[PDB]
Amino acid sequence: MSLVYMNIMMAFTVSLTGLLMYRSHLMSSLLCLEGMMLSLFILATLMILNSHFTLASMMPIILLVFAACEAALGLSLLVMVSNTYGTDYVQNLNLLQC
Amino acid sequence: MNPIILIIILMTVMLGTIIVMISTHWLLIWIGFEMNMLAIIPIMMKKHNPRATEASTKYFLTQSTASMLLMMAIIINLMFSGQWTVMKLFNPMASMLMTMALAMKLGMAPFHFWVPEVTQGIPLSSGLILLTWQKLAPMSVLYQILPSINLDLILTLSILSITIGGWGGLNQTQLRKIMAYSSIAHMGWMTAVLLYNPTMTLLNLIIYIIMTSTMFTLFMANSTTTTLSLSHTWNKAPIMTILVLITLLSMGGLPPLSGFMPKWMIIQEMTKNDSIILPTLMAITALLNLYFYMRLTYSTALTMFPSTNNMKMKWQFPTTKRMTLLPTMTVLSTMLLPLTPILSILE
Amino acid sequence: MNLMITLLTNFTLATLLVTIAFWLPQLNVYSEKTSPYECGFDPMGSARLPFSMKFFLVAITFLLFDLEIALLLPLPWASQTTNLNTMLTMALLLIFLLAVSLAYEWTQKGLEWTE
Amino acid sequence: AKTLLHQYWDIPEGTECHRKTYAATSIGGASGLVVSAYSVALKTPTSFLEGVARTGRYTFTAAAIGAIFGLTSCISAQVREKPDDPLNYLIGGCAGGLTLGARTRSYGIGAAACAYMGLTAALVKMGQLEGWKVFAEPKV
Amino acid sequence: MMTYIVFILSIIFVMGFVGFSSKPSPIYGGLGLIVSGGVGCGIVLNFGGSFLGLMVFLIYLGGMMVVFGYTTAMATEQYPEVWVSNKVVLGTFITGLLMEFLMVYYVLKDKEVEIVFKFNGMGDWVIYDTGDSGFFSEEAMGIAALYSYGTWLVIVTGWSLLIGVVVIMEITRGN
Amino acid sequence: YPTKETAHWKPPPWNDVDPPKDTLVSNLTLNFGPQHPAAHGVLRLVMELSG
Amino acid sequence: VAAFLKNVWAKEPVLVASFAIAGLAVILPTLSPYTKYSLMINRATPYNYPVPLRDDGNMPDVPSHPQDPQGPSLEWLKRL
Amino acid sequence: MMTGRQARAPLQFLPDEARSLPPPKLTDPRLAYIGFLGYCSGLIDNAIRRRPVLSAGLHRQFLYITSFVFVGYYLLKRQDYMYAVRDHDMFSYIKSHPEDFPEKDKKTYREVFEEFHPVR
Amino acid sequence: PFFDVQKKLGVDLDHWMTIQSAEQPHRIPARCHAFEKEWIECAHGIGSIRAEKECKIEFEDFRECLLRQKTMKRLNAIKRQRDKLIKEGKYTPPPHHSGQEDLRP
Amino acid sequence: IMKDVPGWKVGESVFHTTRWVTPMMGELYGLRTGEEILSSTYGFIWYT
Amino acid sequence: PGIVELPSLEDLKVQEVKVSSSVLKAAAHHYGAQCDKPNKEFMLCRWEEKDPRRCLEEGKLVNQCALEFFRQIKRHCAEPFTEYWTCIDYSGLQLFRRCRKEQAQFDKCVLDKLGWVRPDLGELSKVTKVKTDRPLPENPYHSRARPEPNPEVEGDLKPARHGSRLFFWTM
Ligand SMILES: CCCCCCCCCCCCCCCCCC(=O)OC[C@H](COP(=O)(O)OCCN)OC(=O)CCCCCCCCCCCCCCCCC
């Protein structure tokens, strides 16, 4: 295939390794999640526009809609976490270890 | 919680599950997964304690990452196929990513870490809804794509989750963590047979759902969440101790009880294809599961642990709980073995 | 091609004025000129402290309503269809669902600020 | 991890001890790397040096297990002149278990590992002889 | 060189992705994702879908500004590691940039690379089409047909968004 | 089975509700000082705000 | 219900105006007869190419020339 | 297995062809066993609510038995239909493919040879 | 549990989107509509096993229409050989590939 | 160009059919200069 | 696979209608009304056999017909047509509605000189029928032979032989 596909999936893999290795900040992992959804959007619309699948042009709008819905859910859960503890550090979520 | 809002949220969860179950499109499958997850998040936050926030955050992160892998597999299949139909995948990379996404959604080892913590941090009813309802859409999608799953990957996941769940169930004194590790072992049991005969997987799904629903309803009715709290039931209602005794005996695959029927048919199906070492290993780890079930039933039924003084005050009041379908579900979870050829209706 | 030429022309017009605003005049820089300005007195703590926000719910629903209006923008092209009744019904139903969400937030005191 | 097993199994047994020793040491090294990586991921070491020391200790232990297992099995099949026999692999498994006991510095772990790894190595030779399938492809 | 315009835009795309996937600070992560969204809009605009690029740019800019407000409220500290202030962040940023430039040099020399798929060396102008689209734009007409064909999609999306508002309002309740 | 790692692991509470562990909320302390058009010439309002 | 309408117009007239406008927009395409003309105008817009059919012999309805009498004409679009 | 069989005719609990089969008797041992399961469930429903087990709520136990018998009757009809369609498909495939299923000619015991292993 | 409700009820919810050769707004054809039509009609009602055995030619040709691996492979071969010939000095490009030839229409 | 390369056949179609296919963008302007490349491929999108 | 086929450059040579797009747009309706038969024959064949290598002589014929129509236009009303296409060509979007006076002048001159009536609204979008002599292509898609379908299940449903036949269950 084309090398633009190489760079798009390579960006997806970068943001996947970013999400799966935490840096003691939940919001940065949320940003990595939005980066992964952006990469999925770009890849999908690239192939859809190249292969002239015209009816599938409505799809990435729906995908980005659900991306933002789950982002809003993540932000609300982060408000609850930051209202319990002092900060948003991911090491404070260790009560369920005993 | 407003009961109208709770009813709306529960119907939306069910709607997401059937949207996954009835659609012929990968994007609609993904939409159903997203709406199910985002509608079951607030059920786990019903009591508003920090443990519910921890459980909801960990569950949200795991299901989000699994959904991303699901979408990547879908997009790669679109690339190499040019279509969207829910059938086998036309790429091994997409098949492997879809299998790991559905394993992360099912809580299969080595993606099993979130399940005991999420199960512990949420109330008993939300845990029941999780462990029964949420474990149908990934099983349905796995039923759809069985021509394309790599046998080595799915068998590795199945035996790994069986061994890890059976080993981890030996070190728990809370009931919800015990139930989560038992759930991990049972998903290993079902998916070890999926590539051979998926009707066996459907039968195992139904029996496991019935059995764990009966046990969760028993724990809700007695209002016990730890084993030392479960040990007071002989001073409260001995019939409930008899019920938990027979259901724990059935849950270990002990004949002539109905819980032995799934494992028996799994061993029957997997030896038609000359695989003998694997069902023996699964049988021995099922013995480990039966061990921690035996420990629980020694705690609650076959001995009389010391009770307290206020148990008299609890004697004076009869229960008014809404034990919905408990006797029917107990009977189905215990004595369904002479009706074994009923399984052909799932063909 | 012309758009990148225009953007580059605007950018090197903007960065030319800043670069001649940093090297031209005479500088007298001390360890009092660049202190933070707190109306004449020394600040009591850092400026990187958590500045708590009361309108979090309105921001989350701003995300959701921004996506609702993102779904709504194909309407001038969608009015050029043949299945006009179904398009009209789905447009009306989407806008009605937006209004239902807004009204449910209004009746539940979600738009009111905390504290 | 598939081509390493195929690199080990294609040599006839009891023929060249050095190539079989190298192949089995490669299997042991791969096992040690994956075990050590899971260990440092799931259990955080105290510092960098402790992590690399633990990783190196694990892979050296498993590499020793593989090396002396392959050497012992090939030497036994060479001396006995009976290559397609699980007895050679039984002695190889017990020698590996003794090596694990020496690495852990305990005799009980050594004896238990001798017994169990000898049984598993003999069973592996039996499965290679009779074509037993663990991940058997579907037939019916 | 100008034939490789989408290649240069995708290299800026990956540069922003590895800039913000190092997780230095969510302000600078926001800047990096803004850069990535803008250049992704550029990429999909040379592929023809200007509407989709404008929507993804607008949506991500709104989301990034709201989350900037959030980290100025919630995710902030005394001395934010903006960049170069931490060892692991600078190390992983340099590692990602070096890996990306390494594979760009590799694909601009052999004109073919094999990472798990197989990627070609030329620009992506070759995979275009030589025909005309007439008097309409394909992407605009597809998202217009969302209303006349996708009634089920509209129903499930609107219901999911309404219950999403309900979900986020009954999450941040406190009791 | 208690071990060295499982030594500080307390059981969860009976109601599964923890005490709120109220850390200091760190109200921002602004200085509406004299060099301000709002303050009538000279007025040093030390002002503790929650945002 | 008249007292409630008077109260809500006295308190928040913007919501009353919005509800009236939305109700008007909902109920007017049901009762109006000009919508079919819009449907036919949208149908009669030639985006594609009108490819011709092979004359087997039994098709007297389809014309042979653009100026033939038979076929769908657009006189109503001129008059309206 | 039979997914492609129930692929062109979906979501039918019991097709038209199921009526060609004999229905189960009302004195089926399986149906009587399902009714007995319903009776046990009625006893447990009485027992867990601290009611007298054999006397309280006879209408409830009757409804339990009746509902169990009804649902079990339909489930048994489906099970018998599925076994019938399995056998019909198997025999049609055996008839259609005479090459892959040869007719084995059995030999009497005067022609065969079996090794004798003495016990002593 | 693929509880197919759409064929039982007679409604369609996502059937119009699932393939590239379905009905499009004013009949806009895709790039590989014909290849998808050929592969779909080759492998209808024969099952997946017979689909991958008896329609391999049609499916691989359709897949080459989709991603175009071999087309750019041949173009890469031609481009590389032309560059090596230009650098070595055994080839000169024709005038109609240089920038002007009084183009056809 | 292809005279020295062994195993080469000119005019080879990479598809298994004899059906006429739409000419790819690189199959038409593959040998022409970059001005025509920018004018044909990105020409309409870049045009003002 | 197969070596792709392509006609020689002598088969593609033709005299070209060398005019700007404003000349085509100005006289579009007269060209559509007068030259409908070779244009529609070419369109029918081009849509039918889906091949430009087999649709070359009809393109040649349509070029000759368009050139003949323009050569007829040049003989009689060259100056009103020149003014009309100039007034069309000044506009940026080539609007029809900015040159109704030249429309009337060109229409009157053409109608009085040759007798050509412009099509009405909605007439050039009509779908017509074309009578031609080419055979219908039996296989335009070059489809191979379709695979044999699976045999259909037939016969009455007998009861199951000896019941379930599952382990020890007699029914
Ligand atoms: C069917 C028509 C189409 C319907 C769908 C499309 C709707 C488009 C408009 C969307 C409006 C979204 C927001 C609605 C919020 C309603 C609830 C609310 O907030 O009411 C508050 C208001 C009284 O104000 P207060 O209590 O002070 O509010 C707190 C601070 N302002 O309470 C009020 O003022 C009373 C609100 C309820 C009564 C409104 C009556 C309007 C009647 C108009 C004439 C009849 C129109 C025909 C349809 C029947 C409508 C009921």
- What amino acid is encoded at G28 in this protein? L
- What amino acid is encoded at C3 in this protein? L
Q: Retrieve residue B273's tokens.
A: 């294809």
Q: At what angle do helices E151-171 and C56-72 cross, to 10 degrees?
A: 180
3-state helix, strand, coil in chain G (%, to 5): 55, 0, 45
- Report which of E49, B171, B207 is spatially closest to residue B215, judged by C-alpha positions: B207
Contact yes or no for I69/E118 (Cβ under 8 A):
yes
Quickly list H helices, chain D: 3-9, 17-42, 48-80, 86-104, 107-130
- Report chain C residues whose CB lies below 8 A from the CB of A76: 60
DSSP I94: -
Q: Retrieve residue C100's tokens.
A: 């239902």
Indicate the SS3 state at residue B230.
helix
Q: Which residues fall within 8 angstroms of residue B338, CB to CB, at 6 or more apart?
A: H33
CA distance to B344, F32, H16, H23, H81, per residue, from H85 (Å):
11, 87, 12, 15, 6
Cα separation, K131 vs K44, in Å, equals 10
CA distance to J43, K86, K91, per residue, from K94 (Å):
21, 10, 5
Indicate the SS3 state at residue F48.
strand
Cα separation, C8 vs C14, in Å, equals 10
The coordinates were experimentally obtained by cryo-EM
Cα separation, B25 vs J24, in Å, equals 30
Cα separation, B332 vs B342, in Å, equals 13
| Closest-lying ligand 1 atom to the alpha carbon of residue C95 | 6
Cα separation, H118 vs D106, in Å, equals 50
Contact yes or no for A12/A43 (Cβ under 8 A):
yes
| Closest-lying ligand 1 atom to the alpha carbon of residue C100 | 12
Q: From the CA of G18, how far away is ligand 1's center (Å)?
A: 8
Q: Retrieve residue D36's tokens.
A: 């050590």
- Report which of H84, C94, D61, F20 is spatially closest to residue K160, judged by C-alpha positions: H84
User: Do I47 and H4 count as a contact with CB atoms less than 8 A apart?
Assistant: yes
Q: From the CA of G24, how far away is ligand 1's center (Å)?
A: 15
CA distance to D88, D114, J22, per residue, from D119 (Å):
11, 8, 65
Q: From the CA of C68, how far away is ligand 1's center (Å)?
A: 20
Lookup result for tokens 């500080």: F8
Lookup result for tokens 């642990």: B305
Strand F28-32 and strand E117-120: pairing? unpaired
Instruction: State the nearest Cα–Cα gap between G36 and chain I, in angstroms.
Output: 20
- What amino acid is encoded at I59 in this protein? F
With the C-alpha atoms ordered A27, A31, A37, A41, is the resulting torsion angle positive or negative? positive
CA distance to H12, I19, J13, per residue, from B21 (Å):
16, 20, 43
Cα separation, E52 vs E55, in Å, equals 5
Domain that holds residue E76: 2-172
Indicate the SS3 state at residue E120.
strand
- List phi, psi (to 5°) of H74: -65, -35
Cα separation, D44 vs A91, in Å, equals 13
- Report which of E7, E173, E3, E26 is spatially closest to residue E100, judged by C-alpha positions: E7
Other Cβ atoms closer than 10 A to C61: 22
- Report which of K18, K23, K19, K21 is spatially closest to residue K106, judged by C-alpha positions: K23
- What amino acid is encoded at E44 in this protein? V
DSSP A56: G
Q: Which residues fall within 8 angstroms of residue D94, CB to CB, at 6 or more apart?
A: D114, D115, D117, D118
SS (H, E, C) chain K: CCECCCCCCCCCCCCCCCCCHHHHHHCHHHHHHHCHHHHHHHHHHHHHHCCCCCCCHHHHHHHHHHHHHHHHHHHHCHHHHHHHHHHHHHCCCCCCCCCHHHHHHHHHHHHHHCCCCCCCCCCCCCCCEECCCCCCCCCCCCCCCCCCCCCCCCCCCCCCCCCCCCCCCCC
Q: Which residues fall within 8 angstroms of residue K60, CB to CB, at 6 or more apart?
A: K14
DSSP conformation letters of chain C:
-HHHHHHHHHHHHHHHHHHHHHHSS-----TTTTS--STTS--SS-SSS----S-HHHHHHHHHHHHHHHHHTTHHHHTT-S-HHHHHHHHHHHHHHHHHHHHHHHHTT-SSPP-
Contact yes or no for B202/I1 (Cβ under 8 A):
yes
Cα separation, C33 vs C31, in Å, equals 6
Q: At what angle do helices B175-191 and B124-133 cross, to 10 degrees?
A: 0
In this complex, the residue of J19, J24, J31 whose CB is nearest that of residue I97 is J31
- Report which of H34, K103, F30, K14 is spatially closest to residue B332, judged by C-alpha positions: H34
Q: Retrieve residue C62's tokens.
A: 């701003």
Strand E112-115 and strand E117-120: pairing? antiparallel
- List phi, psi (to 5°) of F49: -125, 150
User: Do F23 and A97 count as a contact with CB atoms less than 8 A apart?
Assistant: no
Measured in whole angstroms, the distance separating CA J8 from the mean position of its chain's CA atoms is 17
Other Cβ atoms closer than 10 A to C30: 7
Indicate the SS3 state at residue E81.
coil
Other Cβ atoms closer than 10 A to G72: 13
Contact yes or no for B157/D135 (Cβ under 8 A):
no
Contact yes or no for B77/B90 (Cβ under 8 A):
yes
Q: From the CA of C79, how far away is ligand 1's center (Å)?
A: 28
E62-101 residues touching A, CB cutoff 8 A: 63, 66-67, 70-71, 74-75, 77, 88-89, 96, 100
Cα separation, K73 vs K22, in Å, equals 15
Query: How many folded domains does chain C comprise?
Result: 1
What residue owns the CA closest to ligand 1's atom 51? G19
Is the omega angle on the peptide bond into residue K135 within 30 degrees of 0, that is, cis? no
Q: Assess if residue K115 is contained within a domain.
A: yes
CATH 1.10.287.3510 fits A1-86, yes or no: yes
- Report which of D96, D105, D126 is spatially closest to residue D31, judged by C-alpha positions: D96
- What amino acid is encoded at D108 in this protein? G
Contact yes or no for B175/B227 (Cβ under 8 A):
yes
Query: How many folded domains does chain K comprise?
Result: 1
Other Cβ atoms closer than 10 A to I77: 14
| Exposure letters E121-135 (e unless 16+ CB within 10 A, then b) | bbbbbbbbbeeeeee
With the C-alpha atoms ordered I75, I81, I82, I87, is the resulting torsion angle positive or negative? positive
Cα separation, B169 vs F1, in Å, equals 12
Q: Which residues fall within 8 angstroms of residue I85, CB to CB, at 6 or more apart?
A: I91, J1
With the C-alpha atoms ordered B197, B198, B200, B204, is the resulting torsion angle positive or negative? positive
3-state helix, strand, coil in chain A (%, to 5): 80, 0, 20
Q: At what angle do helices E50-73 and E26-46 cross, to 10 degrees?
A: 180
Q: How many separate helices (H) and strands (E) can be counted in chain J?
A: 3, 0
CA distance to B118, B224, B286, B305, H39, per residue, from B227 (Å):
19, 8, 21, 11, 32
Contact yes or no for F31/F48 (Cβ under 8 A):
no
Q: Which residues fall within 8 angstroms of residue K141, CB to CB, at 6 or more apart?
A: I34, I37, I38, J19, K50
Cα separation, G13 vs D77, in Å, equals 99
Strand F28-32 and strand E112-115: pairing? unpaired
Q: How far apart are the first and last CA of chain C?
A: 53
Say what the resolution is, in angstroms: 3.4
Q: What angle do CA B141, B143, B148 make, to 5 degrees?
A: 90
- What amino acid is encoded at A24 in this protein? S
Q: What angle do CA D38, D42, D46 make, to 5 degrees?
A: 105
Bridge partner list, E118: E114
DSSP conformation letters of B295-308:
HHHHHHTSS-----
Every domain of chain H and the residues it spans = 1-97
Is the omega angle on the peptide bond into residue B256 within 30 degrees of 0, that is, cis? yes
Bridge partner list, J12: K3
Q: Which residues fall within 8 angstroms of residue H91, CB to CB, at 6 or more apart?
A: none
Long-range (24+ apart) CB contacts under 8 A made by B200-206 are B200/B262, B200/B265, B200/B266, B200/B269, B201/B139, B201/B143, B202/B143, B202/B346, B202/I1, B203/B261, B203/B262, B203/B265, B203/B343, B203/B346, B204/B262, B204/B265, B204/B266, B205/B135, B205/B136, B205/B139, B206/B346
Indicate the SS3 state at residue B136.
coil
Q: Retrieve residue G54's tokens.
A: 């092979």
Rounded to the nearest 10°, the torsion over CA K73, K76, K77, K79 is 110
- What amino acid is encoded at B327 in this protein? P
Q: What angle do CA D79, D81, D85 make, to 5 degrees?
A: 105
What residue owns the CA closest to ligand 1's atom 14? C103
- Report which of B76, B113, B82, B78 is spatially closest to residue B94, judged by C-alpha positions: B76
Every domain of chain A and the residues it spans = 1-86
Q: Is the CB of C96 under 6 A from ligand 1?
A: yes
Q: Which of C94, C96, C105, C106 to mutate to test the pocket of ligand 1 (most atoms within 8 A of CB)?
A: C106
Q: Assess if residue C115 is contained within a domain.
A: no
- What amino acid is encoded at D39 in this protein? S
Are K and B touching by the rule of 3+ CB pairs within 8 Å? yes
Q: Retrieve residue E65's tokens.
A: 């500004």
User: Do A40 and B31 count as a contact with CB atoms less than 8 A apart?
Assistant: no
- Report which of A67, A77, A65, A95 is spatially closest to residue A27, judged by C-alpha positions: A77
- What amino acid is encoded at E158 in this protein? G
- What amino acid is encoded at D91 in this protein? I
Q: Retrieve residue K81's tokens.
A: 């047509």
CA distance to A65, J27, J40, per residue, from E139 (Å):
17, 25, 20
Q: From the CA of C103, how far away is ligand 1's center (Å)?
A: 8
Q: Is the CB of G26 under 6 A from ligand 1?
A: yes
Q: How far apart are the first and last CA of chain I?
A: 60
Contact yes or no for B210/B262 (Cβ under 8 A):
no
Q: Assess if residue K157 is contained within a domain.
A: no
Q: What angle do CA B179, B182, B184 make, to 5 degrees?
A: 115
- List phi, psi (to 5°) of B174: -90, 145
- Report which of K99, K133, K128 is spatially closest to residue K27, judged by C-alpha positions: K99
Contact yes or no for B39/B77 (Cβ under 8 A):
no
> What is the length of chain I?
105
User: Do K143 and I50 count as a contact with CB atoms less than 8 A apart?
Assistant: no
Contact yes or no for B247/B330 (Cβ under 8 A):
yes
- What amino acid is encoded at D135 in this protein? F
Rounded to the nearest 10°, the torsion over CA E85, E86, E92, E94 is 30
Cα separation, K88 vs K99, in Å, equals 7
Every domain of chain B and the residues it spans = 1-347
Query: What radius of gyration, in Å, describes the C-alpha atoms of chain F?
Result: 24
In this complex, the residue of J22, J26, J30 whose CB is nearest that of residue E131 is J22
Cα separation, I5 vs K15, in Å, equals 61
Domain that holds residue C71: 1-108
Lookup result for tokens 């590795």: B156
Measured in whole angstroms, the distance separating CA K1 from the mean position of its chain's CA atoms is 31
Other Cβ atoms closer than 10 A to C62: 16
Indicate the SS3 state at residue J23.
coil
Indicate the SS3 state at residue B152.
helix
Q: Retrieve residue I40's tokens.
A: 């779909």
Q: Is the CB of G23 under 6 A from ligand 1?
A: yes
With the C-alpha atoms ordered B156, B162, B167, B171, is the resulting torsion angle positive or negative? positive
Q: Does I67 touch chain B (CB under 8 A)?
A: yes
Bridge partner list, B85: none
Cα separation, B201 vs B204, in Å, equals 5
Contact yes or no for B260/B253 (Cβ under 8 A):
yes
Q: Retrieve residue B158's tokens.
A: 């199945």
Q: Retrieve residue K123's tokens.
A: 């007439």
Indicate the SS3 state at residue B324.
coil
Q: Is the CB of G44 under 6 A from ligand 1?
A: no
- Identify the helix (H) or strand (E) that includes residue F5: none
Q: Retrieve residue C65's tokens.
A: 């309503």
DSSP B310: T
